[PDB]
Amino acid sequence: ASNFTQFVLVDNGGTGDVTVAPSNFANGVAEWISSNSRSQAYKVTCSVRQSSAQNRKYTIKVEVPKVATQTVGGVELPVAAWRSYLNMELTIPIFATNSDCELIVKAMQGLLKDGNPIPSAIAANSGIY
Amino acid sequence: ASNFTQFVLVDNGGTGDVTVAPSNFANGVAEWISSNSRSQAYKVTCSVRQSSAQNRKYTIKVEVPKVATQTVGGVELPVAAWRSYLNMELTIPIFATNSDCELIVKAMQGLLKDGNPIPSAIAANSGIY
Amino acid sequence: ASNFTQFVLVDNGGTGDVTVAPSNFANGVAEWISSNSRSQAYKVTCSVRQSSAQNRKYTIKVEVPKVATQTVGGVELPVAAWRSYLNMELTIPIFATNSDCELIVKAMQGLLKDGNPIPSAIAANSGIY
Amino acid sequence: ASNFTQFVLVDNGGTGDVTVAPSNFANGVAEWISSNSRSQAYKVTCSVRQSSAQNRKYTIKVEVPKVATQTVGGVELPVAAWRSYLNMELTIPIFATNSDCELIVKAMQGLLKDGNPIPSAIAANSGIY
Amino acid sequence: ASNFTQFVLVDNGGTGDVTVAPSNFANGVAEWISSNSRSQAYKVTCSVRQSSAQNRKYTIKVEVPKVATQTVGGVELPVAAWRSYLNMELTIPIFATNSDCELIVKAMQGLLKDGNPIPSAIAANSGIY
Amino acid sequence: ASNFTQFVLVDNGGTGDVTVAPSNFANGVAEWISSNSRSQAYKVTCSVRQSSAQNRKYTIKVEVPKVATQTVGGVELPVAAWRSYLNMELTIPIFATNSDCELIVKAMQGLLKDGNPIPSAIAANSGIY
RNA sequence: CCGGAGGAUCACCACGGG
RNA sequence: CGGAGGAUCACCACGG
RNA sequence: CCGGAGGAUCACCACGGG
Fold it and tell me: Which chain B residues are closer than 8 Å to A117 by Cβ?
């Protein structure tokens, strides 16, 4: 294998797709970013470590730029107003087999499938009701 | 409408599908659980709060159990050999429009699409390289 | 270029081949792990540092597990009955040229070549006689 | 039968082959030394012992010299400019069968096989990258 | 892709070219070295960190050795009579787009083009006047 | 000689070239700047001194303006968002001959030649991977 | 962490600060 | 930095 | 409240801060 390759982060159906590509591997922490200024880029980082004796832990982070009214290549301040941050931590007991892990991934995909509660809420600036 | 509905967490092609349903909303934390004993259930929780004056934070949690039957005191009980814990936090600026938020959702979906780096590494008990 | 890639640790024909893949590279310590339950995985770690003014020191570690299923309370877990631990340290003065190093490597390969004293002894639960 | 015999430590074609021969076996420590001036000789030592109730421990050592002529006062002596030192320890539980041990050996051979990460790094005065 | 590749540091027209290759990435510091003994090697290191909340800093280092053969204790060893050290730090705002960064690279290349002031002064052991 | 002359800092192939010209020589520190407001200019300074008994040290500094979305002749704040800073320090032992120094310059040109790792990384808002 | 036309035997050191 | 020092193995007690 | 490629038996815990 060798999974450190570019991929489509935002699939807008061929036209308007956002692709992130390998941009750093310092300290075993893999990083991908879109072709933008670092302040307006889509960033993705991932790393895995043995957090405890019984667990392994994947730490995934994603940064998504606010696009509405954005000025490409411009200086947009304050930073906190123009960016969303996603921080995921996946803890997997050392007993998990590859199959177990496939299931875990399926569960994550299901959680965010289109039309499901969580994604629908987020996409509508809403909570649960 | 009302987005607090049941959904398929683990899609196994209609056969062996794991479905979670609304089970609690006490204290502003929306909860879903699979049709199991509380000790062997899949669990999904979600809550959103206005973290800062200009940010909103979604806190999502998923628990994937490895079901087993343990014999305690000569008696068989339904338990979980272990659990995998997904803990994710998403911070979105209040200036994010609905289109801005859909972007975030699409990015998260892309991050975990089958074949992409992260899900591949996870499912193979490996890091990124 | 990158030498932090996956490789065959055990060449059992072309079938039961044990392969280890990059898992983590934190704090100057590269680590490879075979697939499936981390609890039954093979582990290889390597690191190099300047031990002294004139010496560079490599520290390699290998773990060979004895795969087994542990049952307790009627609950089975994939585990390692026990593990064989290999800990080696190689010291090379900074005056060593690439050729000097190639030699050192050949010496290591020769020391463990099939049929030679040391490998033969180990493979037979024996010492020197 | 005897495995305390001479062997080829360095396979440089079929010419500049470095061979080490039994020199001493005092106090459970077998020692091989290449021919000619002991001052410029290659050294290999090996010993095994019961490190604990369940573990047997092998301790192998190898010395690779950089041959050189030292001149002082107009007096030349065959010496070693410096030496590369390999010190390795292998721990094997007493439950290991001969097959288990053969595996351990294959793992060691694989770790140093030509082309693999660790050997490549060493042979090139490099670390992992 | 992967930009961690070997390259020609000193172009001497194909004859007497100094080439450096990836040799280490431990601790987030990418290192390249020439095919020499560690004591006589050319060395290039590079690291990038997010210095401030809005800046990124590249730290590049180059070591140019004056190779020599020193006789220590009547023995000849490959050493460096002395070394020239280049230490450069580049701070780029996160708002810099790719085009903005190409500008920086072009400026640095221009700064050192043959015939220009700075390189002329340096190569002549003189200041600017 | 007399190297304190104007030169092309950014070569964009005849059209769109950035030229910096002598603008100050206070304290032996030579300075060049482009035809812009000091806040948006390309600035270059260079000075050389005997840093220690065995070394001479050239200190070169370069400031490059962020051009994307720039408003020519306008007031752009904060300054740190619109400028990149390069600080180079070259230490050369007093034994270095002119030839030695020519080599040092070649090494610097090589380090930044188009297509090489460092320039490629910088130009792509990336690290090494 | 930040600064110096601060030093180095060069991924280190001292100083100065908040 | 040392040990044919121990380990459940990037840890541990001792000696400097 | 905020931060950590901090930990968890997982809506909890410790630490670090203002």
Answer: 3-5, 7, 30, 32, 46
